[PDB]
């Protein structure tokens, strides 16, 4: 019984005002990072990881997002990733999007949950295989697998707003506690974590949140059941209510692959710097993954990408990392 083709739910609306007032006239997913829209980065990541069906949910400025998508590489008949755009003015949170996903019964098996501002080159095949094996061994217990990236707490791609601390059972990579460290100087962990696992309760502060999840349809079912639920609300409620419902959340940590979310201007600058310096290879400015004639360039020394019909004045110096 082979699983159906992998599907993805892409949320093209951030459902917050973290880019005000720049978002007054342009959706966040259409902001150009290294001259390429963020939604293009997310769609390229989804296509490369092996996603065959993508549901793009747009609420804010959905007309512009649809117009941009229709001209994109992924809305062509030759694309192996079929992009279906769902728009509604009644979307106020990721909870609304997932409740509509459940109502439409769009997903039959495990799917990918990402936002429209995620830049990554992660291959999800290993994490997906681990998730499927976990769900096969224990039926309907593990419902979600979050993707994290090893990083030092001092890296520029770790803003205090999105910093998280995770208490994890290292034996099975199971998330036992999830907390956000914004504005905190002392992290508190309930003793209930140290109940069953007497050996591995690793407290990890070296995990960077890639905001990529492998979700079973139970995630949408639970979002429908708990109509008051963002993803963090879902994770906290699932971890707290493990007694009532025996659902679990696991995690997969990647060290050799890049993944980040452009959730603010500081993260935008950090991710753009990483992209220019080939940290998300092969998603490099010269690769022309968008297959656009106006976004091609040649990569010279010192990570200097120069496009066509570019005139450089005499005596001008491009030091490094210039596109």
């Amino acid at each position: 019984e082979p699983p159906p083709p992998l599907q993805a739910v892409l949320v093209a609306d951030s459902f917050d005002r973290r880019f005000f007032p720049i978002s007054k006239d342009q959706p966040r997913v259409l902001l150009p990072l290294a001259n390429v829209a963020l939604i293009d980065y997310t769609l390229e990541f989804l296509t490369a990881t092996g996603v065959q069906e993508t549901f793009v949910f747009c609420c804010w400025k959905a007309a512009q997002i649809k117009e941009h998508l229709l001209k994109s590489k992924w809305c062509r008949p030759t694309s192996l990733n079929v992009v279906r755009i769902i728009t509604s003015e009644l979307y106020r949170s990721l909870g609304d999007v997932l409740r509509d996903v459940d109502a439409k019964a769009l997903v039959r098996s495990d799917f990918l949950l990402v936002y429209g501002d995620v830049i990554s080159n992660i291959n999800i095949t290993r994490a997906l295989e681990e998730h499927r094996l976990r769900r096969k061994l224990e039926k309907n217990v593990s419902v979600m697998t979050m993707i994290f990236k090893e990083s030092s707490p001092s890296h520029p791609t770790r803003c205090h707003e999105d910093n998280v601390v995770v208490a994890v059972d290292s034996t099975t990579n199971r998330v036992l506690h999830f907390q956000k460290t914004q504005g905190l100087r002392r992290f508190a962990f309930p003793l209930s974590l140290f109940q069953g696992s007497s050996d591995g309760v690793e407290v990890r502060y070296d995990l960077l949140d890639c905001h990529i999840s492998i979700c079973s349809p139970q995630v949408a079912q639970l979002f429908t059941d708990n109509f008051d639920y963002t993803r963090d609300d879902f994770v906290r409620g699932l971890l707290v209510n493990e007694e009532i419902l025996g659902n679990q959340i696991h995690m997969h940590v990647t060290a050799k692959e890049y993944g980040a979310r452009v959730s603010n201007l500081h993260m935008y600058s950090a991710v753009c710097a990483d992209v220019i310096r080939r940290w998300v290879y092969p998603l490099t400015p010269e690769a022309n993954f968008t297959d656009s004639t106006t976004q091609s360039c040649t990569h010279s020394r010192h990570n200097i990408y120069r496009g066509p019909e570019v005139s450089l004045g005499h005596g001008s110096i491009l030091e490094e990392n210039v596109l």
Binding site: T87, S88, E89, L90, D100, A103
Partner: peptide, 9 residues
């Protein structure tokens, strides 16, 4: 219960 193309109940 369904929604229109524009998202009307």
């Amino acid at each position: 219960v369904s929604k229109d193309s524009e998202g009307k109940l």
